[model samples]
Target: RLHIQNGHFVLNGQRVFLSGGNLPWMSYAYDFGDGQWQRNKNRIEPEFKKLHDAGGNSMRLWIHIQGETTPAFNDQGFVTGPDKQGTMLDDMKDLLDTAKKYNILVFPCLWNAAVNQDSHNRLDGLIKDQHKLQSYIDKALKPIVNHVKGHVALGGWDLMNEPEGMMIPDKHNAEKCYDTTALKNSGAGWAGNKYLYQDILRFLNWQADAIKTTDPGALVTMGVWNPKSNTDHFNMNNHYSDHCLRLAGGKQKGVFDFYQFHSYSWQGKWDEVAPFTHQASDYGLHKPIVVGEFWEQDGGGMTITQMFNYVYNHGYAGAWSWHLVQRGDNQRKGITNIKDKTSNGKIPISL
Candidate 1:
C-alpha cells in the first residue's frame, strides 16, 4: 500500500508519514561500506531496529555502484544482463532483508550528482549526448531496478542525489561547478541553447520510465541540492542554473513520482532561514514534498530534532538527515560519528 497519490504517501491503506536519516553515509557508498559500511552492515539489523524504534520508517542509501574513488563496478554482481542476480544483488537483498525485519524502507538513488564526482555520472551526458546516455540507462539503472524492483523494503528511486550538480555543482559554491557548455558542444561556449533546461526536462521524464518499466511499484524522485533562496547567484546561472521548477511542471511532472529536495541551512549562509520553506513545485502542479537529505555539512550548529519536527508538522512526506552510519571526521556531525545507527545526524530529532 506504499505509494504516492495527491502529494501524500499512502501506506497500508492510509496516508503515512516518512521521517528518517541517510542513516549511514557509507550505507550507499559500498566502498566505504567496506570499512564503516562493513561495521554498520555487520550490525545493520540491530541498528535498523533501533532506528525504527526511534520513530523512523525509512532510510536513504546510495544506489550508484561505481564512482571517482573506486572501480565503478567492483563486482557488477547486482547488474542484470542475460543472467541471474548474484553477489552485489544479494548484498542489497541482505541489506533490505533486515530492513524488512525492522519495518524500514530504503531509497535507491540512481545517479549521484556530487560536485567533484558528478562528472563521473550520466547526467551531463544525458543532457549533452543522447546515445551514450542510453547505455547508462541500460547499464547503471537497469540492474538496480531489476534487483530491488519489487522488494518490500524498496522506498523508491532517487533519480539523482543533489542533482543540481548538473548545472550548479556545489551548493556552497565551493569552487565546484559543472560546465553545461561541455554538455552541448565543447566549442559552443555556453552559447548553444538557452533551452538547456527544456532538454533536461524531457530527459528526466524519459529516465523515469526505466524504473517504472522494471518495477511498476517504484516511486520516482530527484534529490535536488537547492539553496533556501532561488535568487542565490549559483542557482540562477543561465548556463547551468539549479532549476527546481523543471521537475514540477509540464513533461517533468510525470517524471517524478513526487517532489524531492535536499536542504542545508549552512550551505546558503541563511542560518536564519528554515530548510522547510524552499519550494520546487510552482508550475501549478502540487506534488508531495520529501526532504530526502539534509545536514549541516560545514559544521553549523543547529538542532537536528527541531528541523526534523519542523518539516514533519509543516506538511512533509519525510525528512531525512545526510547520513546514518558515518565514518570518523566527516562533514556529517552527529552523535553517531562512528557510523553507528544513531546518526547519520542527531541535530536532536525531538519533533
Candidate 2:
C-alpha cells in the first residue's frame, strides 16, 4: 500500500522511488485537429511501452479541459469527450490498464494553466466565489477521479500545472484585470509577487484537499517550476519559494504527499541537478522527490545522464525523459520499436 507517514512516502512499508516523464498536452492535441487515439496508439502508448522497457516505472499524463471534444475514440482506441462522445472516463481507464500491465504508475494532472481565465485576474474573486470555482473543479475533475479511484496503476494527482502570477485589479475596483502579460510581469514586484504566490498556494492547497476528500488513498501534489528564497513581494526566489516547507510539514497542511520538480538543461550543464535536488532536501520533507520532467537537445547528452545519476544517487524517486519517442531517430526509437540499451550500456542508471 502507498501511504504518507511523517512526510515520507512508504510504499508497501518501504521507501519507493518513482521515475517518470511529463507528457506535454496529451489530451490537448485531440482538440487541435489530431486524432487522440491515433496519437495514443501511434504515439503515446508506444512511447509509454518504450519507457517501461527502458526500466522506467512512471509516466506523468497532462490533461487539459479545453481539449475535450464530444466523446470520441482516436486511432489508438482511447476515449475523449465534451460532447455526447463516448465516456472520457472509459478512455482514461483503458490508459490506466495499459500502464498497469507494464507496472508503470500514472500521475494524472487535473488542471492546466490555460483554463479558467477569470480566476487568473480577480485573485480574491476565486477565494470569495468558492462555489463557482469549486463547481468547475467538480465538473471537470470529480468524475475523472471517481472513475479511476480504485485503480492500482494510478500513481496520484497533480492538481495544477505551473502557476506563476496573478491578475491585476482594475483602477477603481478590487477585481483584477485579465491580462496574461501583466500577470507574468507582476511577479517581479512586491505586491504583485506576494499576491501571485499566495494565491497559487491557496489554490493548490484547496485542490489537493479536494482530491484527498474525494479519493482518500490517492496521492496529490502541485507542480512548481523552480525554487526561490523565502520573502514577500518580488524578493521571493521561485514560484513555490520558501513556502513549500510549511505546506508539507503541518498536520493539516495542503502540502503534497510527494514532491515533483521540473527542470530543463538547455541553458546549463547537468550539474544544475545538484542544486535543485538540494533545494528539495532543504525542505526537511522526506516525501519522495521525482524530477517529473527533463530533456536535452541532442539525442544523448551529458546533461541527461548526469541528471538521472544526480536524482537517483541522491535518493530521489527517479527522472524521465521529456518523451520516449523523442529519444532516438523516429524510425528506430518509436516506443514499440526501440531496443533496450540500459542493461547493456554503461550508464549509471537506466534512461
Candidate 3:
C-alpha cells in the first residue's frame, strides 16, 4: 500500500523516488484552436512507449479545461476553454492504459498557472469565488481522477504548475504591484509570506482531500520551481527565496503526499541542484521529492542524462526532463548524450 508516515513517502512498503520528464501538449494531435468543441482524438501510446523505453517512470502531463469545452475566459488575451467536443477522457484512458502496460506513472496536472492567467485574472478571480473555484475543480479533475483511480501506474495529481508569480509576484513591477498587494491583503495573504503560504496550503489541502475522498489511494502534490536569484540592480527585493518553499510546504502540514520542484539550468548553473535540494529539505518536508522538470541547453552543455544522474545520485526521488517527444528523432540517443562520457549508456533501472 502507498501511504505517508512522519513526512516520509512510502510506496509499496518501500521508499521510492519518482523520476521522469514532461511531455508535449499534443502527443496525440489534440487541437486547441476551437475551444472545447474541437478536439483531435488520437492515441499517444507509441510516444509514451518511447519515453518508457528510455527508463522514465513518471510523466508530468498538462490539462487545459477550455481545450475541451467553451472559452472559459481569455487565456493571457487568448480566448480558451475546455475540450468539450471530442472524448478527451477517452484519450486520457488510452494514455493511462499505456502507462499501466509499460509500468509508467502519470502525474496529471489539473491547472497551469500560465494558462490560468490568460483566462482569469490570475489569483484574484480564483480566490474570490470559493464556490465557483471548487466547482471548477470538480469539473476539471473528476473525470481524470475517476478514470485513472484504479490504474496501477496512475501516480497522482499536480494541482498547478509554477504558481509562484500568481502566489507572490515582484512588488516593484508597476503592472504586478496591485496583484502583489491584493495577495498581501487577501484572506490567505494576511502576514505577507505567511498568508500566501497558508492560503495555498489550504487550497492544496482541499484539493488533496477531494481526491482522497474519491480515490483514497491517489497521491497529490504541487509543482514548485526553485527560487531564482535576482541580479537586476533595479530591484532590491529577491523574488525567489526559501520563503516560497515554506509558503508551499510549511503550512500544509500533512496535506501533500509528495514534493516536486522544477530545475532548469538556464544560466549554466547546473550546480544549483545541491542548494535547491538542501533548501527543500530545510522546510522539514521529507516526502519523496522529485525534480518534476529539468533540461540542459541545446548547445551541448551538461546532457539530460548527466542532469538525471546528478539529482538521482544526490538522494532526490527522481529527476524528469523538460519533455520526451519534442527533443529529436532519436529520443533514445539524447538519453546517452551526456557531457560526462562516463554517464553514457547509463539507464535508470528503477522508476
- Highest lDDT: give the candidate number: 1
Write the number of the candidate with greater TM-score, choosing between 1 and 3. Answer: 3
Worst 10 residues of 2 by lDDT: 342-351
lDDT by residue (1-351, candidate 1, tens digit) is: 268766667766556666667754444444222233335566566657666666577777764423422113223222222122234455556676767777777776655645434334434455455564455557555665687667777777776665444342222322222233222221121212222444554455556767777777788877766532222332233222223334322333335667665666554443333345533333123567676776654324545655565556555566777766662123223323222222222212211
Q: What lDDT score belongs to each candidate, Candidate 1 first?
A: 0.51, 0.49, 0.50
Question: All candidates: CA RMSD in angstroms?
Answer: 8.7, 8.4, 8.0
Ranking by lDDT: 1, 3, 2
Q: What's the TM-score of every candidate structure?
A: 0.66, 0.66, 0.67
Name model 2 segments beyond 4 Å from true. Answer: 5-7, 25-39, 65-86, 114-129, 165-195, 229-254, 269-280, 298-301, 328-351
**Best-to-worst ranking by TM-score:** 3, 2, 1
Per-residue error for 323 in candidate 2, Å, reads 3.0
In model 1, the worst 10-residue window by lDDT is 185-194
On TM-score, the stronger of 1 and 2 is 2
* Per-candidate clashes, comma-separated: 17, 12, 24
Best by TM-score: 3
| Reference-based TM-score, model 3 | 0.67
